[PDB]
């Protein structure tokens, strides 16, 4: 059952390019998309098969006032991710209307790759929140996919803008996308720029190219997160299957994450779980409480040590969460990739729901309420004005993303005997 | 046994047959080694004894003959098990007895969990004895040399969880002695119960006062997800992995049978299919069913639920959670307790 990458915004395409390029390493597929000459495995969910031996996967490189997607195309990696479909302001409304003016003109290809499948199962968004023309357009796709293919999962893998406060209209650009993200997309993995740059200062002094280097970090995160789906296994070979429990309610699915070896250039189950439960190793920067947790680990560990290890974490009380009812933490066992380099023996990852992301969403809310008393970033461009005559969609977006804060802070408390 | 180089069931008897005293210390070695070479053949001892006596502890004299039959027994069985590891590639047959069938979700069993269990209403009707085996094809995975049959579609309980599918797999004579039909009759039971867990889990997967559905779901997940990880990992992956080493070191017909015969009677107890049904399995079957009941109730979109018995069914589940932690903690008095004490760490609420 098959999955499709609607890679959008230019940062989203750079991280998508790096994700594909990492999967070219993390599979027996050549840079030019032919089977690798080194090559028990399941390409099927992402890749094409023929006597025209380019295994070209379901990639759609949507580009607007375009620049970087061409430079992604003039690579040796070009004939992997190219079904041949590249085709032509930083505000949200400009991105939304530049989506509108091409919508079915792209959706023809969306369907064409939706057909690159004997049975389709989801759409995946590598993305920058509030970013440029991807602002607007990401929310626009969310408003199309949710009615075009309502049974399919739509998941947004989303770098969130944090450059110490480039996009400065970021509050306006984010807020409408978050409004779409709470309502239309099924699950949202959030990644902080400033937490990832803290990893890019932690692991080595490799923060020099952070701007680009950060594409590397998200690719180890992404390849780790999909390592269950790309291979045989007892469970989580099924993408909606992968994410039911990390979503306790469709209001609250904005997943935070952690990675086990920030650097590695023996360990075992208790230290990797103790290591993932660290604010250093979490990718997101009163009271705070977890809701549900997924650890996923590659390694020749086995279920006997995890069953001790859970009780050892529970009696060390690093599992600090049982806030209004039962709230749980997952088993992690998976295969480490053959025929390709295999660093750090238990090199897993966490996904989790916890309420400190509400602080960042409240920060961008409080940036919006600051700029709402200035309105300079309206720039008097006409589309941003006419799209919202009373500014009603921003006001509605404010109450929705404010209710997001109310829901997360209710989730912090025993207030969820009521609604959030 | 009945590849019989021996009537060792009846010849060795204590009354209506008779047994020779000096052979007894090595007679087991003789019968096993003599089976071993009758069987391998389908695929001066009285002059070695002498040059050893020729080079007073009569007991020790006899105890320097016996290395000859010791060596011949070791040689013939050491040839016999390596033969089955190539001519019947026997590690691969036993692996496959789990990997593409009867256990491991694999590639294979999800491309099947997605077919019969579909919801147009069904895909057609589960009772159709042809649709099962047909949709079990595309068992192509890492390899496609399939030879099973998803038989007995119902071959006729009160739950939405429902009975049947007494599955079976082709196993030929070289490996009929190991993988007996009686072993198969137990090997189905793990498959079926696992299927049930996977489908009750699946039905709380494929969904999505209004928050109360969300709560009942979350307090349903917690349970099924942890149990299910106990079945797939704590019981099935663990026994499936610890089995895979020790087969290398069982080194005779009647060693490699016996390791396997223990292994299943371990799966049978540690998954608790045994006669202690009435204390645990009745409870686990209801809380498996309530999930299905809630999944047909909450039609994953409409919002017009409106009927209050399901909130008593939520209280049913709550008192079932007691029926679980208390009866599992009552096993410390008597029972098969220690793997159960590892299920009883279900974290409660």
From Swiss-Prot, chain A:
The modification Phosphoserine is found at residue 119. PROSITE patterns: TUBULIN. Belongs to the tubulin family. Component of the gamma-tubulin ring complex (gTuRC) consisting of TUBGCP2, TUBGCP3, TUBGCP4, TUBGCP5 and TUBGCP6 and gamma-tubulin TUBG1 or TUBG2. TUBGCP2, TUBGCP3, TUBGCP4, TUBGCP5 and TUBGCP6 assemble in a 5:5:2:1:1 stoichiometry; each is associated with a gamma-tubulin, thereby arranging 14 gamma-tubulins in a helical manner. Gamma-tubulin at the first position is blocked by TUBGCP3 at the last position, allowing 13 protafilaments to grow into a microtubule. This is Tubulin gamma-1 chain. Pfam families: Tubulin, Tubulin_C. It is found in: Cytoplasm, Cytoskeleton, Microtubule organizing center, Centrosome; Cytoplasm, Cytoskeleton, Spindle. It comes from Homo sapiens (Human). CDD domains: gamma_tubulin. It is linked to Cortical dysplasia, complex, with other brain malformations 4: A disorder of aberrant neuronal migration and disturbed axonal guidance. Clinical features include early-onset seizures, microcephaly, spastic tetraplegia, and various malformations of cortical development, such as agyria, posterior or frontal pachygyria, thick cortex, and subcortical band heterotopia and thin corpus callosum in some patients. Its main location: cytoplasm. GO terms for cellular component: apical part of cell; cell leading edge; centriole; centrosome; ciliary basal body; condensed nuclear chromosome; cytoplasm; cytoplasmic microtubule. Tubulin is the major constituent of microtubules, protein filaments consisting of alpha- and beta-tubulin heterodimers. Gamma-tubulin is a key component of the gamma-tubulin ring complex (gTuRC) which mediates microtubule nucleation. The gTuRC regulates the minus-end nucleation of alpha-beta tubulin heterodimers that grow into microtubule protafilaments, a critical step in centrosome duplication and spindle formation. One of its GO terms (molecular function) is identical protein binding. The keyword DNA-binding does not apply. SMART domains: Tubulin, Tubulin_C. GTP binds at residues 130-136. It comes from the Eukaryota. The keyword Acetylation does not apply. Phosphorylation at Ser-119 by BRSK1 regulates centrosome duplication, possibly by mediating relocation of gamma-tubulin and its associated proteins from the cytoplasm to the centrosome. Keywords: Cytoplasm, Cytoskeleton, Disease variant, GTP-binding, Lissencephaly, Microtubule, Nucleotide-binding, Phosphoprotein. GO terms for biological process: cytoplasmic microtubule organization; meiotic spindle organization; microtubule cytoskeleton organization; microtubule nucleation; mitotic cell cycle; mitotic sister chromatid segregation; mitotic spindle organization.
From Swiss-Prot, chain B:
It comes from the Eukaryota. Widely expressed, with highest levels in heart and skeletal muscle and moderate levels in brain. It is found in: Cytoplasm, Cytoskeleton, Microtubule organizing center, Centrosome. Residues 1-16 are annotated as: Disordered. Residues 2-14 have a biased composition (Low complexity). Component of the gamma-tubulin ring complex (gTuRC) which mediates microtubule nucleation. The gTuRC regulates the minus-end nucleation of alpha-beta tubulin heterodimers that grow into microtubule protafilaments, a critical step in centrosome duplication and spindle formation. Component of the gamma-tubulin ring complex (gTuRC) consisting of TUBGCP2, TUBGCP3, TUBGCP4, TUBGCP5 and TUBGCP6 and gamma-tubulin TUBG1 or TUBG2. TUBGCP2, TUBGCP3, TUBGCP4, TUBGCP5 and TUBGCP6 assemble in a 5:5:2:1:1 stoichiometry; each is associated with a gamma-tubulin, thereby arranging 14 gamma-tubulins in a helical manner. Gamma-tubulin at the first position is blocked by TUBGCP3 at the last position, allowing 13 protafilaments to grow into a microtubule. Belongs to the TUBGCP family. This is Gamma-tubulin complex component 5. The lineage of its organism: Eukaryota, Metazoa, Chordata, Craniata, Vertebrata. The gene is TUBGCP5.
């Amino acid at each position: 059952r098959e999955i499709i990458t609607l890679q959008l915004g230019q940062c989203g395409n750079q991280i998508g390019f790096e994700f594909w390029k990492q999967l070219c390493a993390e599979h027996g597929i050549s840079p030019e998309g032919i089977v690798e000459e080194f090559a028990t495995d399941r390409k099927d969910v992402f890749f094409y098969q023929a006597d025209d031996e380019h295994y070209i996967p379901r990639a759609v490189l949507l580009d607007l006032e375009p620049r970087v997607i061409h430079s992604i195309l003039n690579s040796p990696y070009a004939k992997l991710y190219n079904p041949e479909n590249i085709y032509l302001g930083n505000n949200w409304a400009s991105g939304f209307s530049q989506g509108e003016k091409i919508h079915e003109d792209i959706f023809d290809i969306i369907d064409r790759e939706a057909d690159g499948s004997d049975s389709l199962e989801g759409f995946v968004l590598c993305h920058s929140i509030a970013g440029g023309t991807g602002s607007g357009l990401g929310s626009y796709l969310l408003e199309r996919l949710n009615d075009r293919y309502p049974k399919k999962l739509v998941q947004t893998y989303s770098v969130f803008p944090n450059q110490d406060e480039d996009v400065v209209v970021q509050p306006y650009n984010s807020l409408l996308t978050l409004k779409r993200l709470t309502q239309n997309a099924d699950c949202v993995v959030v990644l902080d720029n400033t937490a990832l740059n803290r990893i890019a200062t932690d692991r080595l002094h490799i923060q020099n190219p952070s701007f680009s280097q950060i594409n590397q970090l998200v690719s180890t995160i992404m390849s780790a997160s999909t390592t269950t789906l790309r291979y045989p296994g007892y469970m989580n070979n099924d993408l909606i299957g992968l994410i039911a429990s990390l979503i306790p309610t469709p209001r609250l699915h904005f997943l935070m994450t952690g990675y086990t070896p920030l650097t590695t250039d023996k360990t075992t189950v208790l230290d990797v779980m103790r290591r993932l439960l660290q604010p250093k190793n979490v990718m997101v920067s009163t009271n705070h409480c977890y809701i549900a947790i997924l650890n996923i680990i590659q390694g020749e560990v086995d279920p006997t040590q995890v069953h001790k290890s859970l009780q050892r974490i529970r009696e060390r009380k690093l599992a600090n969460f049982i806030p209004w009812g039962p709230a749980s933490i997952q088993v992690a066992l998976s295969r480490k990739s053959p025929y390709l380099p295999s660093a750090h023996r238990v090199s897993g990852l966490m996904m989790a729901n916890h309420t400190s992301i509400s602080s960042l969403f409240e920060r961008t809310c409080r940036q919006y309420d600051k700029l709402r008393k200035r309105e300079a970033f309206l720039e008097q461009f006409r589309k941003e004005d006419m799209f919202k005559d009373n500014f009603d969609e921003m006001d509605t977006s404010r109450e929705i993303v404010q209710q997001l804060i109310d829901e997360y802070h209710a989730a912090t408390r025993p207030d969820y005997i009521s609604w959030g | 046994n009945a590849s019989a180089s021996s009537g060792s069931d009846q010849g060795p008897s204590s009354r209506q047959h008779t047994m020779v005293s000096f052979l007894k210390p090595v007679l087991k070695q003789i019968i096993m080694a003599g089976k071993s070479m009758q069987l391998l053949k389908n695929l001066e001892l009285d002059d070695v004894h002498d040059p050893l006596l020729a080079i007073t502890f009569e007991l020790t004299l006899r105890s320097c003959l016996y290395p000859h039959i010791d060596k011949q027994y070791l040689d013939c069985c050491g040839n016999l098990m390596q033969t089955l590891k190539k001519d019947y590639r026997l590690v691969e047959y036993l692996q496959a007895m789990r990997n593409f069938f009867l256990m491991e979700g694999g590639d294979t069993m999800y491309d099947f969990y997605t077919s019969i269990f579909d919801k147009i209403r069904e895909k057609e009707t589960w009772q159709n004895v042809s649709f099962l085996n047909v949709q079990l094809q595309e068992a192509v995975g890492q390899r496609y040399p399939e030879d099973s049959s998803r038989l007995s579609i119902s071959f006729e309980l009160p739950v939405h969880i429902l009975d049947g599918l007494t599955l079976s797999y082709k196993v030929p004579w070289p490996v009929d002695i190991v993988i007996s039909l009686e072993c198969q009759k137990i090997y189905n039971q793990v498959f079926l119960l696992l299927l049930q867990i996977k489908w009750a889990k699946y039905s709380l997967d494929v969904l999505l006062q209004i928050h109360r559905m969300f709560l009942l779901r979350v307090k349903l997940m917690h349970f099924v997800n942890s149990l299910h990880n106990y079945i797939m990992t704590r019981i099935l992956h663990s026994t499936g992995l610890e089995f895979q080493h020790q087969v290398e070191e069982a080194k005779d017909l009647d060693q490699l049978i016996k390791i396997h015969y223990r292994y299943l009677s371990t799966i049978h107890d540690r998954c608790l299919l045994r006669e202690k049904v009435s204390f645990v399995k009745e409870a686990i079957m209801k809380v498996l069913n309530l999930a299905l009941m809630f999944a047909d109730g909450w039609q994953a979109g409409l919002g017009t639920w409106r009927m209050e018995s399901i909130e008593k069914m939520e209280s049913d589940f709550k008192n079932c959670h007691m029926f679980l932690v208390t009866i599992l903690n009552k096993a410390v008095c008597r029972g098969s307790f220690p793997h159960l004490e590892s299920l009883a760490l279900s974290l409660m609420a």
